[PDB]
Design a protein around this ligand. Sequence first.
Ligand SMILES: [Cu+2]
Ligand code: NI
Length: 304
Amino acid sequence: ECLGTIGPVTPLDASDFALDIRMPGVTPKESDTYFCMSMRLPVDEEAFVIDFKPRASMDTVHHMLLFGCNMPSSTGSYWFCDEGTCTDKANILYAWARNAPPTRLPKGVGFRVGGETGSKYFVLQVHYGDINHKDCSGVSVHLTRVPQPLIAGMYLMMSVDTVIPPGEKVVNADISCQYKMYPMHVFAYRVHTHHLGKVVSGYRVRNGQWTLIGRQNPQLPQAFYPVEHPVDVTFGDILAARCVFTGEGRTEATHIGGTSSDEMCNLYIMYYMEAKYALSFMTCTKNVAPDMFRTIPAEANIPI
Ligand SMILES: [Cu+2]
Ligand code: NI
């Protein structure tokens, strides 16, 4: 339901509050419309996101994403996300998929927001699949001023230079970076691709030995799925991902971009670190060890 007079901030206690990020009573007119809206944080000082609660209209809402960033793409009430999510790098915090119920954040793990360096805005993306009434669906977020012993963060792996020729059977997108930070522990993962993607898989390679982080079919509902067994990545380790693509069906060559006729090989690894060692976001857009992919487990090429 639409919040009305009470407003979006509910105090939970002296140092906690719930912030309701909602659609401002939207009415979609087409199938597969993507709406976005932002919420400046209510506190300027640092705070930690410790919990999320979905408030989705189960009929119309396909998936919801929740980002943190400093420059949302529009200064408006809401907008079509084709205009963009954020001008600066948008950090994903939460993915709600229809047919894949999200996993809770471990206790003591939180995303740092606000303050001098955290995210100053939340941006809510709601995808309306099937469609007069006004929709107020969104997420309810649990913020705390209390410093958390473990800090949540995102290691993002994405391809930039992949080129898929038309009708081509199999095209591999290889991403690889060496980890040069304090240890992190992977606890969830999301895969994102468009319609040409067949399988995505991320690994930790340590002394030539591949440890699976996540292996998923990008056509299946793109939520964050929990890691089978939590995995430490440590200074020296190499993170490695592959997306497997097809060109079959396409008439012209497909590159990396933002439209449906474009592609993307995106593995979001969610992790926690020790608060005093923690950093909040890492990105790999390179393939530093290409010849290493000769020993990639065979599972990464077969479709799930
Ligand atoms: Cu995309
Ligand atoms: Ni460990």
